[PDB]
């Protein structure tokens, strides 16, 4: 969204005698966005001069032009959030000083004022500065830890609750969304590996967890290779137990996708690749060896069984109650989570416990595509079909959660994008089918549960505590243009 407000100034002072034209112009300026660099002191001084009338909104911008301008300005287009924001800030400082020379008072409602707007905006600019500095310092530039992550997300939530009243401004909303996208993308991969290890794990379970960790997080964790190399030689009598002959390796279903993760452990170095497309011995994906050689809770880390269960090519004689009880437990645990909006710390905790389950966004998408690839009609028992539909439930709600988390923000823009995201995910996830009705209801409940942004009517009343009958109009119009819903009616 771009609008050249200089030509808008031309229109404003060309037809200054008409209030309707100025109202229309300021309306498309509000729905539009303006570059910060294009804004100087002379620019919006001429904006004020071009509309010297003060009818209702012209007067409103006479008192609070700064807040109105920052409610629609854009900064992200020029690749300079902090720099353009601070340039805008000092030119607005010049504006505030000019108005103070004209006259200064805390008129209307003290919650919002040009001086108050400048103070809040400079506080936000500072918080942006610490966000960038902590990102730079704790990422080691351009490429325990858990208490540090907890503390830093604590200062981020403190800055959020400081900036919580300021969410209905486009510039503030986009800055906050960018910061939160950066922080979430950083935290989703920077999770530690303490919880993977347990006594009941076998060699295969731990090595598979380590492959998932390597393919999920390798930025600054460089000690993995040596540990894996040592563990290969420590377990010399173990990998041969659950491996099949190379002659009948690739022919069995499900092992084709497992070959990528398998060759990493066979070669003896995660840095190696199967570029030649050679043939190597294949771990037996059959559950007869799986149950005897690994714990059922770590099955999602193992792509072969996911692919085979989704494909329904597993023999009915093969036992599958292990993953049945494991998946029932995890589904019940994750469904019982409260509908209340989890805090940012709570959101990070729930994300990291999801990552502990091995649900990687790329992995989830790449192994959920086959679910629609698999034929709808197949011969199967009751419990395997129940497992397949529960797999659809869990995998698809995880995929929707992750693809909405990457754009998650407690701002109106997140809902504005997420409505279309939900429509697209309905069109792709379900298509024209119907048997996905209940899973779709559960997915909608989850996405409206964990990612619910809430605006209080009392919050708007505080927003308009001192606002008279005039300022309600355009504030409500901006809220409707941003959120897209007639979310209240003002009847005092």
């Amino acid at each position: 969204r771009t609008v050249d407000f200089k030509k808008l100034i031309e229109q404003l002072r060309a037809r200054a005698t008409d209030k309707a034209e100025a109202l229309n112009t300021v309306s498309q300026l509000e729905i539009g966005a303006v570059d910060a660099q294009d804004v100087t002191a002379s620019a919006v001084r001429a904006f004020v001069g071009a509309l010297p009338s003060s009818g209702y909104h012209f007067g409103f911008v006479r008192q609070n032009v700064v807040f109105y301008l920052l409610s629609h300005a854009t900064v992200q287009t020029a690749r300079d959030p902090l720099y353009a924001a601070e340039q805008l800030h000092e030119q607005l400082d010049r504006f505030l000083r000019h108005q103070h020379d004209g006259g200064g008072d805390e008129d209307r409602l003290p919650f919002y004022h040009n001086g108050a707007t400048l103070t809040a905006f400079q506080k936000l600019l500072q918080t942006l500065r610490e966000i960038q500095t902590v990102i730079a310092e704790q990422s080691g530039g351009t490429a325990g830890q858990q208490p540090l992550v907890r503390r830093v997300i604590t200062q981020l939530e403190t800055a959020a609750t400081e900036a919580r009243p300021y969410v209905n401004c486009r510039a503030v909303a986009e800055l906050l969304d960018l910061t939160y996208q950066r922080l979430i993308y950083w935290a989703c991969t920077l999770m530690p590996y303490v919880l993977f290890r347990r006594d009941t794990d076998t060699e295969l379970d731990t090595v598979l967890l380590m492959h998932f960790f390597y393919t999920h997080y390798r930025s600054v964790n460089g000690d993995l290779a040596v540990e894996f190399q040592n563990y290969v030689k420590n377990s010399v009598r173990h990998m041969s137990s659950f491996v099949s002959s190379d002659i009948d390796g690739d022919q069995k279903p499900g092992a084709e996708h497992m070959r990528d993760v398998s060759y990493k452990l066979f070669v003896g170095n995660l840095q190696a690749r199967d570029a030649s497309g050679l043939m190597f011995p294949i771990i037996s994906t059959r559950i007869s060896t799986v149950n005897l050689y690994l714990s059922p809770e770590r099955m999602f880390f193992h792509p072969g069984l996911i692919s085979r269960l989704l494909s329904e090519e597993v023999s009915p004689r093969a036992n599958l109650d292990a993953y049945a009880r494991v998946c029932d437990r995890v589904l019940e645990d994750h469904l019982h989570t409260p509908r209340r909006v989890q805090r940012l710390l709570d959101l990070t905790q729930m994300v990291m416990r999801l990552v502990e389950l091995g649900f990687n966004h790329d992995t989830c998408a790449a192994y959920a595509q086959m679910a629609l690839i698999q034929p709808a009609s197949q011969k199967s028992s009751l419990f395997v079909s129940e497992i397949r539909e529960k797999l659809i439930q869990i995998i698809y709600n995880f995929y929707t959660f992750f693809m909405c988390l990457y754009v998650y923000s407690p701002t109106f823009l997140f809902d504005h994008r997420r409505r279309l995201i939900l429509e697209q995910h309905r069109s792709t996830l379900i298509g024209s089918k119907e048997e996905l009705q209940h899973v779709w209801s559960n997915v909608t409940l989850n996405v409206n549960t964990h990612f619910a942004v809430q605006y209080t009517e009392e919050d708007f009343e505080a927003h308009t505590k001192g606002a008279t009958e005039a300022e309600r109009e355009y504030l409500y119009r901006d809220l409707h243009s941003k959120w897209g819903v007639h979310l209240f009616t003002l009847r005092p």
Partner: peptide, 19 residues
């Protein structure tokens, strides 16, 4: 209040194109 509806419909059309 008509041209704003024009612009919203155009933005929805662009979003459909992106989808």
């Amino acid at each position: 209040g008509d041209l704003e509806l024009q612009e919203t419909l155009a933005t929805e059309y662009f979003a459909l194109l992106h989808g």
